[PDB]
Design a protein around this nucleic acid. Structure first.
Lengths: 156, 123, 129, 82, 205, 80
RNA sequence: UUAGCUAGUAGGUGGGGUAACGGCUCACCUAGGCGACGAUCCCUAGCUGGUCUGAGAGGAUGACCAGCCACACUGGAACU
RNA sequence: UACCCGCAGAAGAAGCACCGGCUAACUCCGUGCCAGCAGCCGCGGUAAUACGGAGGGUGCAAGCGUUAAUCGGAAUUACUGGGCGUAAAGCGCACGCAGGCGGUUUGUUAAGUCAGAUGUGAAAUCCCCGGGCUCAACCUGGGAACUGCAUCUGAUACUGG
């Protein structure tokens, strides 16, 4: 049911008395092709075990993003430690205009038409954190209407 | 930062210099080589790079790398430099095109022939 | 010195929301009470009230929905260092129209949508969403 | 003097003339005071290959503008057909 | 301006059948369709994201026989037009003369249909049209010339055309050898295995 | 009905002529800030009634001299 | 890493001159006028509608087409 | 002349760059930090998917690479749109002219600001809907745009007098 994407796999290291110990880290994202998406970061000595840990961590701690019919609902910007990210809704059939980790997380998150841009450092972990941060605090018309106590027609 | 400060003194751009100044915004330049010699490269590598000191037609005196394997270049030969530095030699910034006015193409070359000026071998 | 009372008002609102204060108090002004009136009729603040005679003090009763604050982004747009004026055909839509932009027109100060309906531009005081 | 003439504005071997009111000293395709129409010499059927703003043309002749031989023939054709 | 190499090689590289042959014989009986061409074909290297976008674009381009310059012009035109970019590009690609000839079954393959158009055997609205890339519009009737109407390959392709699904946006009369393009084909009529959104984001870097 | 300008008088030493500073308020073309820009003009002043620091009203007329194409029509706020 | 520039120079009266206003020119009088919102000096450059790029704001540019200016071996000068 | 009709015959018509990563596409043989490659990281020192040749593959196509030059990526002069404890960056501290900004109430003015109208912003070019060359490039009808400037009338909330 859920679609899982592997974003970046790199080899981290650790020096001990014996010498260098090489470990692997796996950044993956999972989602239901709709408002549910979540990212996982796993680490192990082998890449299959790393990707498996990442998928288990990704399937938990997911969030609900109040998205439109196929796009976002307003231009929103997010930040997490090095990646000022900005994204806005686009018309039908323009695709996912995004780079690196952003493309994978958006695609799995179900949006199909979006203009995005990554400022600052484009580190994959930080941008996928910042992207879901912006998505998490993205207001919806019903939420803002109920929040301010007015009708959705009054706010349009 | 402040808009007042920018009004008093506008944002200075950064004028970029060319890394091939002897061409004078021309694609190639003709020159006569005053010396043909070899030199050793920088720290990681080790070889005898074939380079020639050429006097350009605009008065500049620059060094140019002779590409390919083997060359017939001797002094008083009119060659054509085109720009493009070699990372691993200090002060060599230009390449001499093979196949222009005196510099013959690299013999027995069957791949990337266009870059070294050799006619197509007839079957 | 204190050279922007409107920015000070927005800053008091933002800080009170962050600090979970029920109400904030500041020295009043005819423009502050006007923006407060706009916020109240747009559902951003619960109610406003001005007391005093010689040194009137305006008190804003803040609004909270579902634990967290309602106003999550409020920023001054035309500030004394750089004024911003926009014509009616190029007014901005804050948060795709879900948020509002307090714009001061000739017919009093109103929201951006009201200004578009009424067909006249003005000075853009602040965005609030 | 002020004249009303044709400006060759088209691709090679397929001309298209713009009827313009220009000062006669100037070049053919150059400066003009007011554009008053077109003439497509190779147009097919069902499409108007000539349209003249006869009100402005009359206004300029009243103002003292002369008229070219080809322009005279075109006005004659337009008035005969319409 | 035309690809003159082996046709089945392209199909093998794309993994699927790009309909580059008539369809009378089984594709497996002529090639190793599941295996990429060349010496190192057995291996399945992990394709990058740019790789999958480029593969989809090349897949469509080889399907319709268009070259890169023409295809980029098509993309620019589609992006210029109103609406969904992918549907507009697919419509523009589907509006070509030789493509419509193949859909109508006058030509077994698209290459055969292209040679038919180029060799002065097709007439759009009674006027002879020779350009393979000619865009046809709604309500246009296309037919073979009287001289070329007796060619064996044309009927040989019409019988083959029955084995494939019939286009809902066309009306063909196999006796008089004429068809009628009444509207531009909707995406739902097109084959759903083509992810055109990859091309529309590959070209808009 | 006719185009007319206003400005401070910055100099009146020369006979029958004064320098008038029109102070406009234009938005900066790039940074959007509104800045004051002045433009000194040589203005014909018949009878020499104008002094330093008086706001006057001028209109553009035919060229009196090399640098004089504007002339005053009245004088307001004559105080020191 | 150009801070001062200017004596027909800024203005007035009058005469001359131009198709026409005007230090355009001359006699006399006044000591002014330009300049930190960059005068003067140095280097570079024909200007514009536009062209390329960019989501935009901008950056760069002025070949073809069209508008204006200036020049015709170099430096002046008038005649019709 | 475009264009159309007829004749013989698949004949008279495919090359260029690349394949270690960025970057789509991999193996074998000769050479051993030599010859050489390179836009960056970097290969080659007698088992090179990185040099040269072959086979295979990838991208383009009457073009294909390299060079020169501009913008983008570069949020890397940041107005939109960056920062200054330690990464480059708070003058050693203060007074202060010119300059920038200014608490709160009322009246007046309308300069800044906003609305409407008029004149203007040459034609072409860009954009939209069509038409003509078999299509396209190209040519062309009408509209939009030219975000600007000037004048007239009005609004007075904010800034200025």
């Amino acid at each position: 049911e859920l679609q899982e994407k592997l974003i970046a796999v790199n080899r981290v290291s650790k020096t001990v008395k014996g010498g260098r110990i090489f470990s692997f880290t796996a950044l993956t994202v999972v989602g239901d092709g709709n408002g549910r998406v979540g990212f996982g970061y796993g680490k192990a000595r082998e890449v299959p075990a790393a990707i498996q840990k990442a998928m288990e961590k990704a399937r938990r701690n997911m969030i609900n993003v109040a998205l439109n019919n196929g796009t976002l609902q307003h231009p929103v910007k997010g930040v997490h430690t090095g990646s000022r990210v900005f994204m806005q809704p686009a018309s039908e059939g323009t695709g996912i205009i995004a780079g690196g980790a952003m493309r994978a997380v958006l695609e799995v998150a179900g949006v199909h038409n979006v203009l995005a841009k990554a400022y600052g450092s484009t580190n994959p972990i930080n941008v996928v954190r910042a992207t879901i941060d912006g998505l998490e605090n993205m207001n919806s018309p019903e939420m803002v209407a109920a929040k301010r106590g007015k009708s959705v027609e009054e706010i349009l | 930062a402040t808009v007042n400060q920018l009004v008093r003194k506008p944002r200075a751009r950064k004028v970029a210099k060319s890394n091939v100044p002897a061409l004078e915004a021309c694609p190639q330049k003709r020159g006569v080589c005053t010396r043909v010699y070899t030199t050793t490269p920088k720290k990681p590598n080790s070889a005898l790079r074939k380079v020639c000191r050429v006097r350009l037609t605009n008065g500049f005196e620059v060094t140019s790398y002779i590409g390919g394997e083997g060359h017939n270049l001797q002094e008083h030969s009119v060659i054509l430099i085109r720009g493009g530095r070699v990372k691993d030699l200090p002060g060599v910034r230009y390449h001499t095109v093979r196949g222009a006015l005196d510099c013959s193409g690299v013999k027995d070359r069957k791949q990337a022939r266009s870059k070294y000026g050799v006619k197509r071998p007839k079957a | 010195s204190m050279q922007d009372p409107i920015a000070d008002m927005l800053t008091r609102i933002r800080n009170g929301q962050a600090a979970n204060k029920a109400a904030v108090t500041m020295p009043s002004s005819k423009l502050k009470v006007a923006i407060a009136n706009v916020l109240k009729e747009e559902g951003f603040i619960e109610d406003f009230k001005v007391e005093g005679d010689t040194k009137p003090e305006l008190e804003l009763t803040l609004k909270y929905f579902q634990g967290k604050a309602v106003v999550e982004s409020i920023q001054r747009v035309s500030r004394p260092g750089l004024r911003i004026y926009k014509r009616k055909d190029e007014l901005p839509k804050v948060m795709a129209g879900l948020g509002i932009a307090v714009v001061s027109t000739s017919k009093g100060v109103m929201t951006d949508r009201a200004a578009r309906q009424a067909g006249l531009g003005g000075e853009i005081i602040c965005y609030v969403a | 003097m002020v004249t009303i003439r044709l400006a060759r504005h088209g691709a090679k071997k397929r001309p298209f003339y713009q009827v313009v009111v220009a000062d006669s000293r100037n070049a053919r395709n150059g400066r003009f005071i007011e554009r008053v129409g077109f003439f497509n010499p190779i147009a097919s059927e069902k499409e108007e290959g000539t349209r003249l703003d006869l009100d402005r043309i009359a206004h300029w002749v009243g103002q003292g503008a002369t008229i070219s031989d080809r322009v005279a023939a075109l006005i004659k054709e337009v008035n005969k057909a319409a | 301006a035309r690809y003159l190499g082996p046709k089945l090689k392209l199909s093998r590289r794309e993994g699927t059948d790009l309909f580059l042959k008539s369809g009378v014989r089984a594709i497996d009986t002529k090639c190793k369709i599941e295996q990429a061409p060349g010496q190192h074909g057995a291996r399945k290297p992990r394709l990058s994201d740019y790789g999958v976008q480029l593969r989809e674009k090349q897949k469509v381009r080889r399907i319709y026989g268009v070259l890169e310059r023409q295809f980029r012009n098509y993309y620019k035109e589609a992006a210029r037009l109103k609406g969904n970019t992918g549907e507009n590009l697919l419509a523009l690609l589907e509006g070509r003369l030789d493509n419509v000839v193949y859909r109508m079954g006058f030509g077994a393959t698209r290459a055969e249909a292209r040679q038919l158009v180029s060799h002065k055997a097709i007439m759009v609205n009674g006027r002879v049209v020779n350009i393979a890339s000619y865009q046809v519009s709604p309500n246009d009737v296309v037919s073979i010339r009287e001289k070329a109407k007796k060619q064996s390959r044309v009927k040989a392709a019409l019988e083959l055309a029955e084995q494939r699904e019939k286009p809902t946006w066309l009306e063909v009369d196999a006796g008089k050898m004429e068809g009628t393009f009444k509207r531009k084909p909707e995406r739902s009529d097109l084959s759903a295995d083509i992810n055109e959104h990859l091309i529309v984001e590959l070209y808009s870097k | 009905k006719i185009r007319t300008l206003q400005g401070r008088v910055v100099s009146d030493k020369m006979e029958k002529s004064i320098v008038v500073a029109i102070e406009r308020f234009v938005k900066h073309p790039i940074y959007g800030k509104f800045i004051k820009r002045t433009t000194k003009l040589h203005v014909h002043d018949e009878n020499n009634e104008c002094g330093i620091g008086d706001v006057v009203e001028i209109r553009e007329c035919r060229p009196l001299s090399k640098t004089k194409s504007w002339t005053l029509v009245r004088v307001v706020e004559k105080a020191v």
